[PDB]
Amino acid sequence: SGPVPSRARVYTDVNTHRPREYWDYESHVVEWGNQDDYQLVRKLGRGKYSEVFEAINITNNEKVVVKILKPVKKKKIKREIKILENLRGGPNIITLADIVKDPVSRTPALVFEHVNNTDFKQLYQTLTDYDIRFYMYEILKALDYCHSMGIMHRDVKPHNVMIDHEHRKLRLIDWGLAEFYHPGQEYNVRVASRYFKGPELLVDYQMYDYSLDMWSLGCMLASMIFRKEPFFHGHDNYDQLVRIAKVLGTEDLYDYIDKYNIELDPRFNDILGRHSRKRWERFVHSENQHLVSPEALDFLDKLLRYDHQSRLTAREAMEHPYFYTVVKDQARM
Numbered sequence: 001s002g003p004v005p006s007r008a009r010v011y012t013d014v015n016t017h018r019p020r021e022y023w024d025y026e027s028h029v030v031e032w033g034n035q036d037d038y039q040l041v042r043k044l045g046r047g048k049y050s051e052v053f054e055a056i057n058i059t060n061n062e063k064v065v066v067k068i069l070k071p072v073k074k075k076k077i078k079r080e081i082k083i084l085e086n087l088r089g090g091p092n093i094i095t096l097a098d099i100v101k102d103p104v105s106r107t108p109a110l111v112f113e114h115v116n117n118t119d120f121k122q123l124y125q126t127l128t129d130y131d132i133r134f135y136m137y138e139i140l141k142a143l144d145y146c147h148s149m150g151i152m153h154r155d156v157k158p159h160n161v162m163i164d165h166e167h168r169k170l171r172l173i174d175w176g177l178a179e180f181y182h183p184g185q186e187y188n189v190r191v192a193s194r195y196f197k198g199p200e201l202l203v204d205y206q207m208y209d210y211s212l213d214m215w216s217l218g219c220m221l222a223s224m225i226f227r228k229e230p231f232f233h234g235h236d237n238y239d240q241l242v243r244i245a246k247v248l249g250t251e252d253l254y255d256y257i258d259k260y261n262i263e264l265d266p267r268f269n270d271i272l273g274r275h276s277r278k279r280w281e282r283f284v285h286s287e288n289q290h291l292v293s294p295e296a297l298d299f300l301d302k303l304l305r306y307d308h309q310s311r312l313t314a315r316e317a318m319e320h321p322y323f324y325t326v327v328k329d330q331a332r333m
């Protein structure tokens with residue numbers, strides 16, 4: 001018999017109550033502008049995949065970022081555009097300024113509000129205790145907003161968080177894997193980067209939701225408070241679940257498998273073995289102990305659960321004692 005169905009605990013039906021045009025991105029008609037309104041200044045280091053440039057808007061001499069959409073289904077292009085349009089003006093969501101095509105090549109490009117080219121990965125192994133809490137709270141604002149708007153990011157990782165540390169400003173970027181949540185929809189599990197993949201992706205449970213992003217967030221938090229990059233260091237997608245099992249233990253993993261009647265790929269049979277759930281003190285040492293608190297560990301524990309339904313929602317996360325001083329100080333300013 002099949003896997004047991006699953007539903008998001010929050011924001012379950014938000015897209016159903018919207019007009020069809022909100023989430024039906026395949027039918028979205030794009031008015032493509034002219035990339036000649038923009039002059040490329042330089043290529044921003046975003047990996048081997050990426051074609052992201054600093055550019056100038058001629059009209060007003062404003063600095064922008066241009067992302068040339070490397071050849072991919074028009075469907076995926078429409079999806080990223082519709083999601084950016086839907087979330088525009090949301091807290092800590094990157095602003096889509098324009099949608100253009102090179103007149104010669106006809107290659108589609110996205111034009112964004114300028115951000116400094118400093119991703120969170122360059123900074124997140126050097127933060128104070130307070131700044132980890134502050135920036136985690138800022139990421140949660142973006143995730144609670146996109147979840148509340150019926151969208152899961154599905155690629156939450158340090159490289160997709162742009163920070164202006166001087167101005168204490170943060171933007172969640174690269175909405176290219178983001179998808180609308182629809183109750184009962186089975187999604188592609190080939191999303192997110194290896195180290196940030198939730199167990200649902202690794203065991204091929206397709207009826208997942210916003211809670212995927214909360215696992216990724218847990219992986220970033222663990223990396224920051226323990227100064228361990230990445231926290232779950234798998235050699236591949238199979239070994240990734242072994243690395244998780246060695247920390248969260250195998251008892252809760254098999255309970256999860258049983259609960260959702262998941263058919264476990266037989267390759268897992270010999271490699272998962274038997275592991276106790278490890279106490280977090282195991283990862284604490286002299287060079288990270290100033291970042292680790294009971295509050296931090298209680299919060300982290302409630303993000304990193306096999307059972308996606310069990311994980312804190314973004315809003316529940318924002319209400320955790322870990323953030324009380326950040327909440328207090330925000331209200332004060």
Ligand SMILES: Brc1cc2nn[nH]c2cc1Br
Nearest residue numbers: 052065112115173174175
């Ligand atoms: Br920098 C930058 C990189 C991005 N990748 N995907 N969207 C993006 C927006 C900005 Br701004």
